[PDB]
Design a protein around this ligand. Structure first.
Ligand SMILES: [Zn+2]
Ligand SMILES: [Zn+2]
Ligand SMILES: [Zn+2]
Ligand SMILES: [Zn+2]
Ligand SMILES: [Zn+2]
Ligand SMILES: [Zn+2]
Ligand SMILES: [Zn+2]
Lengths: 254, 76, 152, 75
């Protein structure tokens, strides 16, 4: 008999969404659910509903949707499987979840060049002697030396054309001067990894870049950690090391 | 009308908008194409931070103009 | 979605009670803003209450709400601007299953026993870590001087 | 077990693998089904660059998971 009881779990591996056998309450929306109306995660055996799992994937900017369960004692560390995430989202919402993980990995890497074609999602990795990149999405020859697409003209001509095009672009010079002023005055900084311009609103003295998940020490104006991420004290500001704060004004940068 | 929005390092977006579109709507369109929530967005055009409530015509934002996106991250 | 859960949360909060969170000023106009009164139990905060304002986001409960202290307190985890660094409601530790009463009791536990490892005032954290006596005395004086009054 | 490999062009391949299969083995299957040499291949799962030597079970890559293929151009 037990050879068939243990056999019923290979059966659950067939379908993606393992539904609930007995009725259970969803601990996020408090809605009574019948067998077949609730979804049970596989890596933690927690039961939720239709929408609440869909909302957790939406309002999550991490490439790994964590299980949304916590009670009086412990906090669940289970993850949602892609088979469960795909079977919960629409093809449009699922493709956005896949593009989030690609964006995080692209900006985390210091050798990622994106296509300069507007709205294009094509990118690649480069070495140090590569000079061209034929984008596989729009078939446009991205030049890597001057870091822009210039077809039917050489680099010397594109540089000349860019100068003439920018010599009388007052709006471009204005927003450039604003950025330069914002960095000098310490109102904003470029994220030390993905180089995006970020500004700290309220809080203490540390921020996590929502583009590449790099932790930034606001006071020292640089990476909080080394190349190893959170915990790595081989680089960064090395705050609280031997009790010394990273800067006399720092109060909390993790 | 079409405008350009420079977000991530090297990525350029194109948004379909109208001069009557408010700054909140433009930030929402960026979210649909980038997932960045509007509360973490601040837009800069020609050296001025676009304030919520105003429209693109209020800042004389015409066609094929390029906006710049900076991220306002909340500390902890 | 946020209005549906927050409605049901206040129903049970007023059904049982907390004995440590009184004056539950919840205007039904804007359900995304609550006002409450924390009443600590252990010293150096047992001689006064604290007015707090909790703001719930539009994406609640999929995004964390945040609490600001109206009554200023001499606490290493609470700056003089009213902010409190609570790990339960941080943008990275937040979990949609976290209930409002759990947040309230976690903040009350943080007030009852501060934790100088994630402080907002580094000097007060160092004082709490080293000289517990002088920190407790200063906190009692601050609670008597600028703190509220405990509702019975 | 079967997994998916999405290339930025939009094309999705299905590979029959096992949790003990190394990343080098998966890149070899990609070469056998696409002609892309493994040294010019980079696989990404859940925002992490898959390193050679490790296995799919090391990255918790289960069946019907979607990896992403990006090109590493040699100078
Ligand atoms: Zn639910
Ligand atoms: Zn769980
Ligand atoms: Zn392209
Ligand atoms: Zn060139
Ligand atoms: Zn970054
Ligand atoms: Zn630091
Ligand atoms: Zn520091």
């Amino acid at each position: 008999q037990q050879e068939g009881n243990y056999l019923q779990h290979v059966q659950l591996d067939q379908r993606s969404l393992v539904l609930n056998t007995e009725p259970a309450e969803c601990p996020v929306c408090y809605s009574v659910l019948a067998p077949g109306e609730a979804v049970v995660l596989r890596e933690c055996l927690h039961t939720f509903c239709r929408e609440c799992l869909q909302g957790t994937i939406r309002n999550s900017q991490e490439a790994e949707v964590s299980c949304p369960f916590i009670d009086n004692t412990y906090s669940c560390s289970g993850k949602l499987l892609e088979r469960e995430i795909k079977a919960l989202l629409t093809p449009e919402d699922y493709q956005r979840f896949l593009d989030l993980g690609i964006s995080i990995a692209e900006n985390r890497s210091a050798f990622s060049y994106h296509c300069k074609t507007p709205d294009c999602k094509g990118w690649c990795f480069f070495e140090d002697d590569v000079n061209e990149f034929t984008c596989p999405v729009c078939f446009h020859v991205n030049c890597l030396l001057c870091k822009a697409i210039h077809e039917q003209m050489n680099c010397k001509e594109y540089q000349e054309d860019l100068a003439l095009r920018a010599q009388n672009d007052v709006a471009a010079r204005q927003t450039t001067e604003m950025l330069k002023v914002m960095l000098q005055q310490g109102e904003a900084m470029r994220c030390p990894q993905c180089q995006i311009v970020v500004q700290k609103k309220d809080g203490a003295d540390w921020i996590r870049c929502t583009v590449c998940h790099t932790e930034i020490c606001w006071v020292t104006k640089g990476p909080r950690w080394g190349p190893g991420g959170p915990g790595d004290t081989s680089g960064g500001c090395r705050c609280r090391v031997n009790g010394i704060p990273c800067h006399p004004s720092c109060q909390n940068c993790h | 009308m079409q405008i350009f929005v420079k977000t991530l390092t090297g990525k350029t977006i194109t948004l379909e908008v109208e001069p009557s579109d408010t700054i909140e709507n433009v930030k929402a369109k960026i979210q649909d194409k980038e997932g960045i929530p509007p509360d973490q967005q601040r837009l800069i055009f020609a050296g001025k931070q676009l304030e919520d409530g105003r429209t693109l015509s209020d800042y004389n934002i015409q066609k094929e103009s390029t906006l710049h996106l900076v991220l306002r991250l909340r500390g902890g | 979605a946020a209005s549906r859960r927050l409605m049901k949360e206040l129903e049970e909060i007023r059904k049982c009670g907390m004995k440590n969170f009184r004056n539950i000023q919840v205007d039904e106009a804007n359900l995304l803003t609550w006002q409450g009164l924390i009443v600590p139990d252990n010293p150096p905060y047992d001689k006064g209450a604290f007015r707090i304002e909790i703001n719930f986001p539009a994406e609640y409960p999929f995004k964390p709400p945040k609490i600001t202290f109206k009554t200023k307190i001499y606490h290493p985890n609470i700056d003089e601007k009213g902010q409190v660094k609570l790990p339960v409601i941080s943008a990275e530790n937040w979990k949609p299953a976290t209930k409002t009463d759990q947040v309230i009791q976690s903040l009350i536990a943080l007030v009852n026993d501060p934790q100088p490892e994630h402080p907002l005032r580094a000097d007060l954290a160092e004082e709490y870590s080293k000289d517990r006596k002088k920190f407790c005395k200063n906190a009692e004086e601050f609670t008597k001087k600028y703190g509220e009054k405990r509702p019975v």
